[PDB]
Amino acid sequence: RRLFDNNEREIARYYKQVVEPVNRLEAEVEKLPDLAAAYRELKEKHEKGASLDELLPMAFALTRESAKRYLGMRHFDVQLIGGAVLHEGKIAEMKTGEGKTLVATLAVALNALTGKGVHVVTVNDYLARRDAEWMGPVYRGLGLSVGVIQHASTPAERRKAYLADVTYVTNSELGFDYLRDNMAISPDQLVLRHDHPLHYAIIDEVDSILIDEARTPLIISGPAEKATDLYYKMAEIAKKLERGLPAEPGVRKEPTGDYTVEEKNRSVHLTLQGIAKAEKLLGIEGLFSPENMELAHMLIQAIRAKELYHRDRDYIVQDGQVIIVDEFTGRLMPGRRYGEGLHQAIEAKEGVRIERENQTLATITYQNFFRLYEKRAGMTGTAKTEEKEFQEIYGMDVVVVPTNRPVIRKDFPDVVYRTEKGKFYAVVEEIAEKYERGQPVLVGTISIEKSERLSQMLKEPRLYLPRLEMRLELFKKASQKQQGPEWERLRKLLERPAQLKDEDLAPFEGLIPPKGNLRTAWEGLKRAVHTLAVLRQGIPHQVLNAKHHAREAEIVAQAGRSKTVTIATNMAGRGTDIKLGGNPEYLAAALLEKEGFDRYEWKVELFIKKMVAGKEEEARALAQELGIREELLERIREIREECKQDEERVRALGGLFIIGTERHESRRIDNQLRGRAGRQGDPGGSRFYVSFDDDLMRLFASDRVIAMLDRMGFDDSEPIEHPMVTRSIERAQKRVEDRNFAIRKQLLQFDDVLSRQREVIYAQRRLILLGKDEEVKEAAIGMVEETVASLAENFLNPEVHPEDWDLEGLKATLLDTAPQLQDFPFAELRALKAEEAVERLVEAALKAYEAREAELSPPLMRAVERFVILNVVDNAWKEHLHNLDVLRQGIFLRGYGQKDPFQEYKIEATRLFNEMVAFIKSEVAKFLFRLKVE
Template sequence: MFKKWFDPSRKVLKQADIIAKKVISLENDVAKLSDEELRNKTEEFKNRFKNGETLEDLQVEAYAVVREASKRVTGMTPYYVQVLGAVAIHEGNIAEMKTGEGKTLTAVMPAYLNALNGEGVHIVTVNEYLARREVEGQIGNIFRFLGLTVGLNIRELTREEKQAAYDADIMYSTNSELGFDYLRDHMVLYAKDMVAQRGLNFAIIDEVDSILIDEARTPLIISGGAKNNQNLYERADRLVKTLSDEDYEIDVESKTIELTPSGINHAEEVFGIENLYDLQNVSVVHHINNALRANYILAKDKEYVVQDGEILIVDQFTGRILQGRQFSEGLHQAIEAKENVQIKKETITVATITYQNFFRMYKKLSGMTGTAKTEEEEFNEIYNMNVIVIPTNEPVIRVDASDYMYSTMEQKFKALLDDVEARHKAGQPVLVGTIAVETSEYLSLELRKRRIPHEVLNAKNHAREAEIVEKAGQIGAVTIATNMAGRGTDIKLAEGVVERGGLAVLGSERHESRRIDNQLRGRSGRQGDPGFSRFYISAEDELMVRFAGDAFKRRIQMIQNLNEDKEAPIESKMFTKFVTNAQKRIEGSNFDSRKNVLKYDDVLRMHREIIYKERRDVLTLESIEEQAIITLKKSLEENALDFVDTTIRNPKVDYEALVKFFDGPIFKEGTLLIEDIQGKTYEQVLEHLNHLADIEINNKKTTIPPEVFNEFLKVIMLRIIDTYWMRHIDTMSELRQGVVLQAYGQQNPLVIYQKEGYRLFNELVANIGRDITKYILKANIQVNVEREAVVKNTATNQGSEDKAKKQRVRKIRGRQAPWR
């Protein structure tokens, strides 16, 4: 009762109901407008916004205009419940709308409204196919009919094409492309090359749970260069394959693995080292841990598949192959060693960000999905978004039957196949949901034995997805699908299927996330259609093994033995509740894991924001002489202070060491003489250093034109910032792996990471300052200087970059850069 009372949906829906009724009341008035008058409403709204009206003031009229435009362009008029969803989205919430309720059309209303301020709206989809479908199809036509521009941002576009997409009023894009564009924008050499010129204003994320939760732990990585450590992967793999069961320990519940004392001894013998956990052996430990995970935790045809000598990752939430992606931190190479395929070189990370931190940079964020309520706490805590459950347009009449439980997998699959066969004979279409590729292939083999025609939709067969889904609602159709049969596509029922009970969805096991189970159920019973769903579970399923073990299996067998029919399923609310609780525990554990990732990434986020701001200033400011001089003076002061003994009452300066440090390495040799500073106080010495710097800077400025001096400063600052930032990311990554061991010493790894990260960042800033100072004071400026990228041939962890998107280095009348 209290949960319902304090549910944010109540308050939002109450307010949304008032707005929706006002929108619908304008239907007849707006219908009288001609096409031209309807289109002119956009310009009228924009002018009213400029004259002080808010988007909230315009909301009712704007939504009414969109409803009429949709009716004229597509023949579809958004329902009352879709207007409710549109109100929730505009307020920065997540609209939970069931499958088939028209989320795509719902998003048009808040997107149109928020585009009126001229700052741009990004609509984010889970794949390029969906983004292209909306832009080139009827949805894009609604926006164009109303006089708005619509852009499509996909992978293969050139920079100029991407800029045009970002400049559009409404831009459709995938989540990964947006993230990579942000990272690439902070690697360009000229401000004009940045694609997102207007910043991040408002995003509507379709399938928001998939993007902000399922993919939250996957960082976006741009890499370049290569580490040469292939041999270490092979040695670690050989070691791990020779281990006995006593040499390692697996925690089934948390899916972690580690060496036991006997395993550690064995590793030390093989690698010829005295202490495996000595600091100098961090790299060896890292490779062994990856080899352990690759061999004993990750399974072929479940977490990954091998195709054409390549390791391809399978998304555990959608069942799709994640084309071009790699497991990070060397795990991918460890799997390649395990499967004996060619080991790709591990690359150096040049830029990285998580989806969590990227999407939190938007001024306003909202989303829509069919399943989000179970993760409401996370959405609220991490993204400050509430989940608003929008009622369905027609009542849901699908029958969600209770789970059938068996003691063994063999019994479960036999019963499932019997059910499929009976429904197929009756002409009812059946969708069998599986979690792993191997399960879908096993069931396909068994159906072939029974001579039941069927289609299989899994990571190995994703190319025919649209065709398979289209036929899944035909009379007697049988479709076996991993979790991919869900996102963005509807299974439409053929004539005569409704009379046969609609689509039957049969789950071959429970997923560790309740959302994925709900999605599978949601394939059936759309828009008031009849339907049926049931899950078949056994005590040998992974979920049950992880959280129940042998005791649970014995209990099921005992109950089965009491029945006259030993093969009969067990239907029990108690066992169903147990399964749900196991799912809740995993969801809680995954939430904690994502929160932990975010806490670590927040450390790097603060560093990234500071460095990216500095870099953006270098690109966008007309002159950066003032910033460069401030950096130089601060660096001189901090470095000079290192040679002053401040522990005594009258601070003493080490003149010889100070001259040795500055004369030659920082200033040109012979500039700073010991007789000029001998006997002076620290303040006087600093004043003299600043005076020498001023002379050197003025000499440079008098010999070359001001624009060349300014370009020289930009060249060295970009080069130095990029070089040190790239090293810093790599150092922080190694630190992240290293601090885990601090837990054994009763210390909080996160606290150590934060403290050490703070020290490393200060070191980074000091190094950047020192190098900028050195180049300003020592470099012989040529009249021709050029900007140059620190790392070339960059690739992303979602595949190599397209040639068209390589950074174009524009030469500025020159051949040689000043630091060479």
């Protein structure tokens, strides 16, 4: 191995470049009165230009020593490796719990120098909190601030949290905060830093977070973008509103409507009568321009739907709803809506019912998200299995870090049973054995109904009756071929279930042939009789359907004690190391009702950890500063010395011994249940159970196998050992694995399209929120530039030299820009063609802005820009994310052959966007010109 792979020659170089050096410098470093000072010094050294790589040894050594002084755990050489891998922005694969947490600090420190920020994510809040406080002293001991985010945390706490040197958050939490930040209104809503703000991440359970959890995106559904009431009331007004004629010689627009020349696209409802008529309905003319920007929208769109969109020509309506039509192919547009929200408007005009449900407001995929960090890395006991994915999607390579102590755990094969019912009976049987022997046990299920059902079998013994009986009638059928007196005697003893204790069967053993066939059935019947008795005798459970993360964890920490039997539901006690007799936990429990934990954590635990360790010297100083008199010092020696002896009984009784009830949807998710045992060189074993009925085999096994298996007619009660069976099992788990792979591969495909789309709109939103006035005003003017340009230019730019179009270029610019200039445009415009038209207008436009920078002092004018732009963009955006959702779960129908659905989607997607931007820029301009500050 060492000769062969990457994961060996590599490990050696890590020892050479990291381990040995950090060890060589432990001497010097331990003779430092202040590690904080040393760290503060390193920050300068690095800020002096010293690479983060070169400083690694020092930093690492210092963190180890700080860990040694304020926490009391010297980083094992291999943990120093995990650290480097982490810093190297890779995945460090490491087997059990605790090893992982501490390894984080190593890299966490080295990179916290930059003070740009450091994020450490875990599967749940509990652990975030835990790991944070648990490792707090090592961090503080070097001068590092501990930032922790829990779900309950408020926008405030969150911001403080990320502002700390190191932050502990769950992936979903850190996730949505990213999305929220890009949905923020006031800068005092944003939580992440602005400086970096997703600098470096260290994912605690990568494979779980970036794989078994990255099969779905992060979605925030909002209420319906404004309800049916306003949409239908906007249709009625459209018809009540009479129709108008265009501009005559010198005399202006007729009524409310100024059509687009049926080929142009602009709906110019401008006669103030029209404006006034509409507002008279539910608002004031004032409110209409300022603040009712969304209403104008709805008004504008309503008239646009009626007037510039021919119903049965541009879209054929059916009992379903409005279905757009393509002038492209001369067909219906399958599941395609209309931009700016004009869709429901065209529905409101057609009296077609509109939706009243949620919709996407912001969406990100865990993949693309973590892809944003300046540097990502992570850890887990199971990851090499998916290295090629990690490497390819997140860029991280996987490094298989050496264990501290050789694994000794005895992972047994599987045990297959035809019926799930039979599989469980088998499981109880295992359990009872281990209980009676005194070896602890930890069963893993995949559901709560299953966890409890297991419970009930163990608690009421009346459930094991069917087994007993089934083993009884089996013994029976082969048995009565034997007729004598003695036989008839046990024939009635066996006509009653309970009489059957072990003593009832002992006397007739004389009738048992050594020969296989029958003794086999007799040993079977005897076994069951015994099992029942054990059951009845009572087996203490402790089920852990992961509901109260904190409560169960404590219960988990003690699962390593001799007669314990824990039913962890689904990764229930995920994160709490199970040692063979839990010591400091119920030690703290004693110290709870005396000298609390919170405050004195620096000493309490270092005392609990010192006593158990047996350091009369370090234990006493801590005892002095504390209120610990002999009575407490003794019950600790008593609990401790009792546990050492339980360890001895257990640590020689076998070990933990995990029992998986059924296999998971991935070898890694179940290689972890086995992982819970034989932690650090400890003894231990594992064994999985399977049934053709349990999950894996029916949901993901082929419909042909789930059929062949049955017809194979396997012996319902006893174990199954057959090629076809073990073939199909091992293959089913792989189908699923692969299915999920696909399921997520496609999710990223889709969200790659969106990325470039988010990219822009997300940043265009921030330039305006960052508030760079200079950059705000510049950009704002830029939108006036393009709108006006292409607007007039639409037809003011013909190859036909002077003659062609002039009045439509006047009104189009007149609407989008309240101001006016009108006698000299004709001069240079109707006479001198296309080049000196576009640039003679830009200049005039600026002049008006400047004058407006006088009306409302310059401060308010940009204030309007901020209000206007955001309101326009984010109002248009939400309608896109909606339009897209409806496009994905629409165009997926078997469209035209070979052109992948995707190609069609990508094509249309990019289209809608560009169009959307058009609408944005254009609308920003207009509204900046026709708004009313007051």
